[PDB]
Amino acid sequence: ADSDINIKTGTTDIGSNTTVKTGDLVTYDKENGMHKKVFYSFIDDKNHNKKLLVIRTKGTIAGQYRVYSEEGANKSGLAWPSAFKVQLQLPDNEVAQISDYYPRNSIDTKEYFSTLTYGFNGNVTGDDTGKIGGLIGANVSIGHTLKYVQPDFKTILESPTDKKVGWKVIFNNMVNQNWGPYDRDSWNPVYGNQLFMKTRNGSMKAADNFLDPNKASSLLSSGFSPDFATVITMDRKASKQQTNIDVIYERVRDDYQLHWTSTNWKGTNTKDKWTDRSSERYKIDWEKEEMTN
Amino acid sequence: ADSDINIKTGTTDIGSNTTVKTGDLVTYDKENGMHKKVFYSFIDDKNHNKKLLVIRTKGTIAGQYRVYSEEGANKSGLAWPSAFKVQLQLPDNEVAQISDYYPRNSIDTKEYFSTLTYGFNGNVTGDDTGKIGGLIGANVSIGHTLKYVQPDFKTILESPTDKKVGWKVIFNNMVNQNWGPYDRDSWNPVYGNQLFMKTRNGSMKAADNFLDPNKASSLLSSGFSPDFATVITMDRKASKQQTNIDVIYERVRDDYQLHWTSTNWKGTNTKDKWTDRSSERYKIDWEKEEMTN
Amino acid sequence: ADSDINIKTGTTDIGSNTTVKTGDLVTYDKENGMHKKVFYSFIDDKNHNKKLLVIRTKGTIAGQYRVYSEEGANKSGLAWPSAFKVQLQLPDNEVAQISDYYPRNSIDTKEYFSTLTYGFNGNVTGDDTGKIGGLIGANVSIGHTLKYVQPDFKTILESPTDKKVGWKVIFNNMVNQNWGPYDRDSWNPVYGNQLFMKTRNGSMKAADNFLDPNKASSLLSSGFSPDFATVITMDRKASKQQTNIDVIYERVRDDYQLHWTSTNWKGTNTKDKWTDRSSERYKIDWEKEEMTN
Amino acid sequence: ADSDINIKTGTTDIGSNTTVKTGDLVTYDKENGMHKKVFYSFIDDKNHNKKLLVIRTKGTIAGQYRVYSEEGANKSGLAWPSAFKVQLQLPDNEVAQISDYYPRNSIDTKEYFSTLTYGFNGNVTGDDTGKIGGLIGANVSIGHTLKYVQPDFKTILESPTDKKVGWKVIFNNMVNQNWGPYDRDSWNPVYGNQLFMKTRNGSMKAADNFLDPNKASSLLSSGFSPDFATVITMDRKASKQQTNIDVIYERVRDDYQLHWTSTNWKGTNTKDKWTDRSSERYKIDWEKEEMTN
Amino acid sequence: ADSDINIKTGTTDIGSNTTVKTGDLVTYDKENGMHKKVFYSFIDDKNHNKKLLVIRTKGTIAGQYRVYSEEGANKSGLAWPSAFKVQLQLPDNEVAQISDYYPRNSIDTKEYFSTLTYGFNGNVTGDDTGKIGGLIGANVSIGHTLKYVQPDFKTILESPTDKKVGWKVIFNNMVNQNWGPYDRDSWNPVYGNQLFMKTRNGSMKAADNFLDPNKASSLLSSGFSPDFATVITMDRKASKQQTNIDVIYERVRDDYQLHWTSTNWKGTNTKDKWTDRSSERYKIDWEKEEMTN
Amino acid sequence: ADSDINIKTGTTDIGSNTTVKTGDLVTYDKENGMHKKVFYSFIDDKNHNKKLLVIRTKGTIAGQYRVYSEEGANKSGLAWPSAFKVQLQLPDNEVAQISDYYPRNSIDTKEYFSTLTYGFNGNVTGDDTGKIGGLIGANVSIGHTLKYVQPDFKTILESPTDKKVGWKVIFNNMVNQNWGPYDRDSWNPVYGNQLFMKTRNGSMKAADNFLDPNKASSLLSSGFSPDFATVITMDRKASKQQTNIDVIYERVRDDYQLHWTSTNWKGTNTKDKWTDRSSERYKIDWEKEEMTN
C-alpha cells in the first residue's frame, strides 16, 4: 500500500479532477436464460497517459438444474451447470488494450498438524485367591491432520492477453445431506457417483430420486451473478477512436443420470454434455465517451 | 475494488451532483398478514446514460405458525411457513428494464479435515509365580471430518430477466431441542418427521405436542422482514415515461401433522399445502419522479 | 449496500439539508418498576414524499427476580421475568403509518460436524513358555456433532402492521453453576426443573436455596434496557396533522417453586403467572414537529 | 442503525451547532481510599426539547485486599473487595430527570455441543497352538459439552428510575493458581473455600498462606476505575434552574479466613462484612452551565 | 505508526501539494504467454530531497500446466510452473537508484502445544463362580502438536541492491485430492512423487493420468498476476535526466513424469527443466515525466 | 488513547500547520550485501518545545544462507543468519537526543488449559458354559496443555539511551519439514542438531543434504527488511545546530555443519562464527533541515 512506501494514501490513483461518464446496458437472452448487464465508466484523466474504460460485467446466468429425460421409473437424467463463464475480447485489429481486471487468482492455503505422543503405564492386579499380577507397557503414536476450506465453486481468472480476458466459475465439490463432499469424479463401486442422489435404495421413480435443488448449491438452480471488472486503455492519438468488443456469457452443463440396479440406485456423470453461449458486440466510442449495443 | 485497479475509490459510482427524489409507500394486507413497504429513490444522474430508480422492498411477512386442526387428543395439524417470497414484475410491453438487484447468491463453502495416525506399543506381564509375559501391538487409523454452517433459512435470488426478479427465503433445516437438525424430509420409522415434535412419548393432547414457537426459528411465527433492492433503468428518450410494475409478497405453508400410533408420537409433513399471495400494482412516473399505488 | 449496485454510498438516504427536531420524554412507573424513555426525531425532508418521525423507545424495565413466596421451611417461590415487551400502536382513525422498525428477526445458524473414522491394528503375544499369541482387528466409527450458540434471552420483532409494532425479549435458556443450560421446561424426574435451584440436597430454608442473582443473567434482576426504533410516515396533505400513539412497556413473570421432598429439592415453573403492563399515550403534532405526553 | 432505516448516519443525533461547556471536579477521600472524579458536559441544543447534562463518573476505588487479623500461626483473616458501586441520586423534589445511562446490561450467551457417535469393530485371534479366536462388538455414546466465558467481575447497571441510577461491579469467580475457578460459595469438605488459599498444608503462619495479590485479579488490590455515564434532562421553562445531585462511591468487603486444622488449611468466607461509603453533593446550575462541589 | 511516536498521522508522507503524472504501458508476449503491464507514477514533491517514480508491475503470467511429452501409452510428462518471477534492473551506469519495494518478506510463525496427562484407575471383578478380583492402574502421557499454515505458493522478495530488485512466487506444496500435501521432493518407494498423479492403479494411458487442473492450484494453469511496487529515486541535479530500466517476467517449469511399473503408477519430478524469460526495456524521462517502451 | 481521557482524538499530536521537509538516502554495500535506506523527516512544529527528526531505517539485509565449505562428501558446512541488527548512535558530545523509537518490546502471552476427568464403567460377561461375569471400575485424570505462538525470528528493541538505540531480529526457532521446531541449541544424541538437515540417512553428498532454502524461513536467504523509526529532538537554542549520527546494519552468521557417522548424518551448530558490519555517518543540519551522507 502507498503507506508502506511512505507515500500519501491515494496519491497515485487515477480519476481526480475528472468528469466520469457512466452507462448501463441490459440484454436478456430468453433462449439461454441469461440476464446480462454491462456497467461502464469512461475515465479520461489528463494527468494519465491514456484514456480508460472500466467495463463491469454483471447480471445473472440462470443455473437450470433440471430433470430432462425419463425412460422408465428406473432411469432418469438430470442437467446441471458445471461451469459459468464471462469473456470479453477485442478484435485482432483493435489498438485499445486489456490493461487490468479484477478479481484475479488468489493463492490457496491449508493448515497442517503434526502430533507426537509418548506414554507409559503400569498395573498391579490380584484376586480372592491370593494371586498377584503385574503389567508395564509403553506407547508411541504419530498423528497428522490436514485442514483446508473448499468452496462449492471456484472463481478463476482465465489467462488474459492484451486482447482478451475471462473468468470461469467452476463446480468444485458439494456436500450432499451431510456427506461427501462429492465432485464430478466421485465413484463408489456400489452407488457410483452419489453427487445428486437423494436416496440410495429408495423405492420411487428415478425422476424423483434427485437431490432437492434447495438442499444443493443455489448456483445450480437459481444461478450465478457475475461481478467482474475489466479495464481497457486507449491512446489519445490512436487514429481510430471506435472500438468493438465482444462479450460471451456461457453455461456449461453436465449430465447426471440415475438408474436402478435391481438392488439399489447408481449414479453416473458425463462432463460438458451441453454448452449454452450468448454473445453480444458492444461499440465503444472514445470521443463521445459512450458504449452501445 | 476500485483500489485494485488503481482508480480513486468511488470514482465510478453514480449519483454525485444529482438531486435524488425518494419516497415511502406502505400497504397492509390483513387477510394475508403482510406489512408491505416500498422505499424508492429516483436518481437521474446526467453523466449516466439512463434514468435510474432504486426500489427497496421491505416490511415483513408474518410467519403464522399455528395449530389449525385437531381431530381428538390423538391427532392435530400445524401450518408453518416453509417459504417467503418477494417478486417484482414489469409488464412485457414496458421499455424500462430491471438492471441490478441485491442481495445475490453467494458461493457456499465447507471445511474438510483428513487425519492419519499410527502408533506402536509395548507391554510386559508378570505374576507372583515367576512367569513373564509380553505384548507388542501396532495400529493405523484414517479419519475425515466435514464441517459446514447451515442457516435455518436460505436467502436466494431467483433467476431474473429484464422484466422480472425475485427472492425466496426458504426453510433449510432447524435444531429441535439440541438435536437434529431436522428438515422437511427428515424421517424416522418410529417417530416419522420430528421437526416440530415436542415430546416422543408425551401423554397429552396432540394439539399440545408441537414445539414451543420460542424454541423454534423466529421467522416461523413472528415472521421475516424482506430487505431487497431492485434497480430499474429507463431511457431518457423513451416516448412513454410512465411504467407499471407489480409487486407480489408471498408465503408458502407446509402441513405438519402429529398422530398417536398407540405407543409413541409420529410426525408427517406435507409440502406446499397452502400459498398466500398478495399482489399490488404501482405506477412509476419518470418525469415527476414519484411512485404511487 | 449502495456500492453493491454501483451507487455512491449514502446517495439514497433521507435527511440531508434538513433541520431535524428532536426531543426526550421520560416517565417512571414506580408500581411496575419501569423507567420509560422516548427519544424522538422529526425529519421533514422535502425530497422525500412524506414526513418522518423516528421514535426510539429506551429506558429500562427492572427484572425484579425475587423470592416473594415463603410457605414454611420446605416451600418457597421465586418470581422472575420470562419476557419483556415494548409495543407501539396507532389508533384506527389515523392516516399516519408504521413504515419501518429496527431491530428485526435474524436467521439463526448452527454448525454441523460429520465424522467417519476407520482403522486396523495388529497384536502379537508371548510368554516365557514358548507360547505365541496373535491378534488382528479393524474398526469403523461414524459420529456427528452439533454446535450452536444460544443467548440467554432472544430479541424478537413481533409481526407488525401499518398500525402496530412491537418487540419481545424472551427467556431462552441459562447456565446454572457450570451446568445445564436449563429452560422453562427442563424436567428431571428426581429434581424436577433445576433452572434456579442452588443446591440439590442442601439443608437450609427453601427461601435460601435459590440461585444468587449475581450468578444468573443480569436481565433477570437489574433489568433489560430497550433500544428499539420505529419510523412513522405521514402524508403532508392529510387533513389532520396530529396523531395519537400508545406505547406499552410490559413484563411477563413466571413462578419458580421449590419444595423439599423428604430427601432432596424439586423445582417447578409456572408460565406467565403475572403480567405487568404499563401504557402511555403520546400526542404527535406533525406541524409543530413536537411530541408530548 | 440509522442506515437500517434508510436515514443518513447521525441525522437524529444531538449536539450540532451548539457550544458545549465541560468541566472536571476531583475529590480524594483518604479514609475510604477513593479517587473520585466527575467529568461533565452541558449540551443546550435548541432543536432538542430539553437541556442536557452528561455526567461521567470516573476515578478509582482502591481494592484494599489485605490481611487485617492475626491470631497466632494457625489463624488469620483477609479483607477483600467483593463489590464496587457508583450511584447518582437526584432529590425527590427536583424537576430534572435521569434520561439515559451507559453501559447497560447485555444478554450473555453460551455454546452447546451435542454429540452422537456410532461404533463397530471386529477381531480375530490365534495362539501358536493353532486355535482360532474371534470377537465382534458394537458401541454408541452421547456427549454434551457446555462452553462459556466468565469475567472475574461483572459490570451491572442497577435498575434505574427517573431520580436514581447506579452500577455495581461484582466479584464473579476467579482462577486460583490454575485451579477453580472459585467463588464466594465454593466449598470443599477438606479445605472449605480455597478462593485465596496459597497452600493446602504449607508449614508457615496463617498470615502468610493467602494468595499473592499479584496472582489474583488486579481489582482486588490496586482497584477498579469506574467509567460510567449518566444523562440528565431539564425543561428549559422550569422556574428553578439549579439542581442538587448526590454521588456515592462504595466498596463492599468480604472476610476470608484461614485456619490450620492440624492436618491442613481450611478456608471460610463471610459476605458483605464491611461497607465503605463515600458520598458527595454537587450543585448543577443549568443557566451558568457549571457543576460545583 | 505515527501515532506511536506522537505525530499526526500522514505528517511525514510524500505527495501533498504535488501534481502527479501517471501512465499505463501494456505488452503481451505470445510466445511466453505473458500479459505484462506497467502502471507508473512520477511524484516530484519539492519538499522531498529527490524526485520519485513508483513502478507497479502487474498483468499475469499464464501457468501453462500441460502434457508435453508422451513416449507410448505408459510414459508421459507434464510441464508445470514451479516459479513465477518479476525483476527490474537499472544499468550499472545509472545515477537513479532503487529505493523501496513492496511486498517484502514477513516473519513466519507456528503454534506449539505441549501436553502432560497423568491418571489413576481401579477395577473390581467377579464371576458367577464366586471369584473376586481387583485392579489398580496408573499412567502418564506427553503430547506435542505443531500447527502451521502453508500457502500453495510463497511470495518472496529477493535480496535487492540499489540497482536491482525482484520477486519470486515459488511453488511450496499442494493437496492432491485430500491427501498430501506434496512438494517437489515428495517420495514414496512404491509410487514415487505423487504430486500430480490422478490414480495409483488406473488402466488409462499415462497422458490421461495427470491431476485435473481444476483440482490443483489455479496458478498452475490459469496463472499468477504480479502486483509488485518499486520505488526509484533520482537526484534533481543529475546531469542526465533520462534513465533506462529493464523489466523481466519469467516462468520456471518443472517436469513431472509418470510411468507404469507393471503394478501401479510411479511419478518423478525434475526441477527447473525449462525457463521462459520475457525481457523489456523502458525509457524513463524525469523531465517530461513519462515512461515509454 | 486520547478518547480514553476525554480529549479530542489527535489533539496532543505534533505536526499540524507545519511544513515538513523529507528526504531519501540510499547506499548499497556490495561486500556485505546490504541495501541501506534512510527516509527522514524534519518537523519543526512551533507549538512544540523542540525541533524533531524522524529517521526511518529501511532497505534490506540479504540473508546469505549458503554452503561455504565442502571438505569431502561426508562433511560440509552451512553459513546462515542468526541475527540482523540496525543501530543508531549520536557521538558523546552531541546535544541532540534520542527521544522515541518504534517498534518496542511487547509482552508475550501463552494459553494454559487445565483439565480434570473422572468416570465409571460397568461390565457384565457371560458364556455358553453358563458363566456370568461382572465388572465395576473407576478413573480420574488430570491434564495440562500449554499453547503459545512462536515467530521464526523475534524483533527486539535493544536497551536505548539518549545517545543510542537499536533493534535486533534474532533467530528464534523453525519448523523443518513438519518436524521440530528446532533452534540453535537443539540436540539429539543420534543426529545432533537437525536444524537444517534435509535427510537423516540420505546417501548423497553432505553439501547436498542441507534444507532447501525455499522450505525454510525466507529471511535466512533472501533477507530481512528493517522498518524501524527513531525520533531525535533538538533544542532550538543549542549553540551547534549540526549533528552527526552513525548507523550500523549488521548480520551475524552461525556455522551449521553436517558429517556422516558411517550410519547417518549428524548436525552441529557454532554460534556467531561471523559478523558483517556496515557503518555509515550522516550529517544532520537542523537549520537547512537536510540530512546527508
Curated annotation (Swiss-Prot), chains A, B, C, D, E, F:
GO biological process annotation, one example: cytolysis in another organism
InterPro entries from the UniProt entry: Aerolysin/haemolysin_CS, Bi-component_toxin_staph, Leukocidin/Hemolysin_toxin, Leukocidin/porin_MspA_sf
Keyword DNA-binding set for record: no
GO CC entries: extracellular region
GO MF assignments: identical protein binding; toxin activity
Coarse class of the protein's main subcellular location: secreted
Alphabetical UniProt keywords: Cytolysis, Hemolysis, Secreted, Signal, Toxin, Virulence
Result, substituting H259L: 46% of normal hemolytic activity, slowly toxic in mice
Pfam family, one: Leukocidin
Resulting phenotype, H144 to L/P/R: Decreased hemolysis, wild-type oligomerization and target cell binding
Gene3D superfamilies: Leukocidin/porin MspA (2.70.240.10)
Keyword Cytoplasm: no
Compartments where located: Secreted
Function: Alpha-toxin binds to the membrane of eukaryotic cells (particularly red blood cells, RBC) forming pores, resulting in hemolysis, with the release of low-molecular weight molecules leading to eventual osmotic RBC lysis. Human RBCs bind much less alpha-toxin than do rabbit RBCs. Heptamer oligomerization and pore formation is required for lytic activity.
Subunit: Self-assembles to first form a non-lytic oligomeric intermediate, and then, a mushroom-shaped homoheptamer structure of 100 Angstroms in length and up to 100 Angstroms in diameter. Interacts with human ADAM10; this interaction is required for toxin pore formation, disruption of focal adhesions, and hly-mediated cytotoxicity.
Domain notes for this protein: The mushroom-shaped heptamer is composed of a cap domain (comprising 7 beta sandwiches and the amino latches of each protomer), 7 rim regions whose protruding strands may interact with the membrane bilayer, and the stem domain (52 Angstroms in length, 26 Angstroms in diameter) which forms the transmembrane pore.
Family (UniProt): Belongs to the aerolysin family.
Name assigned to this protein: Alpha-hemolysin
Organism annotation: Staphylococcus aureus
